[PDB]
Amino acid sequence: SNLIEVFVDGQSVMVEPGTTVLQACEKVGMQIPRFCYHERLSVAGNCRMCLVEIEKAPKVVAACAMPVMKGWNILTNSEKSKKAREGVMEFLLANHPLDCPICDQGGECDLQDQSMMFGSDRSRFLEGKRAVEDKNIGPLVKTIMTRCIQCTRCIRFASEIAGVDDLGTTGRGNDMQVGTYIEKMFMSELSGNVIDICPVGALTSKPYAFTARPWETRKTESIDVMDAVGSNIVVSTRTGEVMRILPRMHEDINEEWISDKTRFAYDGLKRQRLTEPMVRNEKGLLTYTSWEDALSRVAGMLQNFEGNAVAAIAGGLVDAEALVALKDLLNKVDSDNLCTEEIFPTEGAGTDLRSNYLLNTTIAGVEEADVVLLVGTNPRFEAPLFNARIRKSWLHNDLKVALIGSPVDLTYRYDHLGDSPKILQDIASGRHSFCEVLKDAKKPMVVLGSSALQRDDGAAILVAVSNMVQKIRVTTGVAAEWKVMNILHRIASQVAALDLGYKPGVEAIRKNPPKMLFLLGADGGCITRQDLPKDCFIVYQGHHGDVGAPMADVILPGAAYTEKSATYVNTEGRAQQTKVAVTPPGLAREDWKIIRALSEIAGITLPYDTLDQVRNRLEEVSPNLVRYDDIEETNYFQQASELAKLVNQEVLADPLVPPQLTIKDFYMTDSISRASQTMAKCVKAVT
Amino acid sequence: QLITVDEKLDITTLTGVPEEHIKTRKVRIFVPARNNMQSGVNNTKKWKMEFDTRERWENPLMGWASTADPLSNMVLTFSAKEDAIAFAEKNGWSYDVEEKKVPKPKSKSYGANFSW
Amino acid sequence: ITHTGQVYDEKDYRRVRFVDRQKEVNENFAIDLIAQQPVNEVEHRIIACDGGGGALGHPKVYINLDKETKTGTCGYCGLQFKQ
């Protein structure tokens, strides 16, 4: 018990040695007014707006940097610590430009409040204010930096979370301006977080410039579907259209940060969006028609076609509830050709034991690892808020990162073992140098990005990695609950698909062409009318008209994750629930119901008729979909290896390369993104 | 006196709520999350019970947002999971409790950034 | 068409409204009236812009006409100032 005892205005709390004075007040429950101190950012002491008075002490101390000592009673509401705030707030406000009705961080200001609660009723600054020169930091951040309180949060985030040290302070005195010395845009993922982290409205979001004002925004808590980290987010909706998506904190998944894609592609959600159910008509043009007519177009073809003549290529952002409603339907006409666009090697236990296909070590385990051998992925642009995880654990802890992929910008110092899938065999043999490095690791982890598995020798690549994980585990003698093998995805509806029993890859549809295909939100080119039977009856089930719509005999519009109470699951199997922020547009309907209804018109009606019932259905297919925010550990790995050992495959010499080589690759990757005007502006800025 | 009864005190029939707004409607007990835009933690301390989001459409004449969900602007505020589950069960609504998410303790030190 | 679009598409049934009636539309677009104004030349690096008034104009903000490259524009009046 190394607790040390310290008094918060008397509550006499006991705290670990090394907790800051500000932290001591927090556990009692008091809040020190603070600027320039963020929990996951280094203490800087720039503002000194947190001056408090420990007891019988000569001067005020900075609650952000003073380690509380033994038996110091903090007096947070003394007559002194209020003159130490009534007089600081005098200064921050003195050089501040009064354009609060321009500053769109109007009600979202941590500087008006603290002025309005702890600061002063009046002003004594009868002199002249200063002005700085607005510069361009990008097409996402509007830096009206005459607002800046030189709190250096931005500089730190830019250097400690995102590894992009482009921002910095220049000059001394009252014209220290915290902007890039040369005008180089702040181009990085994790970029938009600066907005959320600058308490002042100096730099704010340019798309959401002046569309709203925070008191009005109704805030619904939901889940990120753009990437497979499944970052928690809050969708701010006003009068029924989404106005902004900002992060909400999840310790394990996104701890207060969200990607540039899943914050500025809410605009893409509002155009090129399907709404009414069109049906090919006349010469072939698609013609808007009522559900009844469009549904029976599909139902009639479904009754005519038998099993293995009906197939589904789902993929992208479809929810688990639709995925079970599409499987239950196509099995009621006996085709189990349901498939996903992202090919996960099934030449093994395959989709059968989750240990196989789930980051086993959780995102939060990256903090406890000792060496990570990333093979096949550019975590940065595939799963950015997991790249950050390895960013923090390489800085605050000591992770030794090794990449077997293309040498790529990783925001940290990795070891480039090489660009060849066969050198995986080199480490398994113990031939390559890093073989000992791992031998030295007590808690190692290996990450294989699905983006590799998508090549032709992906089955061989998974088997080769499983062999190395096997002897890495044997040589290290790592404990059982520590799990070395994990694989990260880049498609939101993959893990759930795989769990619900959907077989990955369109390989099965390729060998026998289905008379009728019900593409379920699939905008990928995995099959085309060109590769289908002459009949080629195909019906798109989705939200945005992109690739599957113009080659579709029927259009059954659906919703998006802002518009339905569906479930998703990220890579380590944590199921999460999207909440309806806005009602779905036009005649468009929830994905699960379209398929329950088509089944009623077809006559093979599905059992559930309300969503709680579909949640009960999910419980039957895979039981850890009905369970939210819980990661389950049963590492059925040992048996996975046995089947891997049976599988014999050749890893071709072609280097394994992540598709998202540089950030322009990243911006536009999905229907809701490829339709983004903001993403498009970002794409041309890079090009 | 002191009669004994064994119900979950369903006052669903004393409340006066039209059936369809007591049957097909899910309350979501949760402690509101912080506005990333600010760092004040005073709006993440009391458990709220908000209802499902139904249609918010457009008034043809002026373009305003219109609605038919009488229980749309409803955000009852409780002080503990226990007291929110009780009210929902009391009124006959379906609930989706979400556990609180207090930040864990993260150790912060000024000197640390000076090491080399 | 209003300064902010709004023009109804010919097919829009929302056009009956104006039958035997008309459409309230302001002819004085502020996008152009403000452009029909002389860039306020100044000597000082920074200048104020009370909105041409004290308490009868807009909150007073100081604009940095520091780069001839850009004429500072008070976010309230849209007045460009030429260093």
């Binding site: 259209e241 509002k270 155009r271 090129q272 969006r273 399907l274 709404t275 009414e276 069109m278 090919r280 010469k283 072939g284 043009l285 698609l286 013609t287 009318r529 945005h544 008209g545 719509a549 113009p550 080659m551 259009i555 547009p585 036009g586 | 457009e58 004449l61 002026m62 373009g63 | 209003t2 902010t4 679009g5 709004q6 929302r14 409204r17 104006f18 035997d20 009636r21 008309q22 459409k23 309230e24």
Partner: peptide, 27 residues
């Protein structure tokens, strides 16, 4: 120091949504 000019309201909003326009020629 009966009239036709009657105020009529709008939705001065720029329509806030965009539907996919179906492909012009068949496949």
């Amino acid at each position: 120091p009966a009239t036709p000019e009657q105020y009529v309201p709008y939705s001065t909003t720029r329509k806030k949504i965009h539907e996919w326009v179906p492909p012009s020629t068949p496949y």
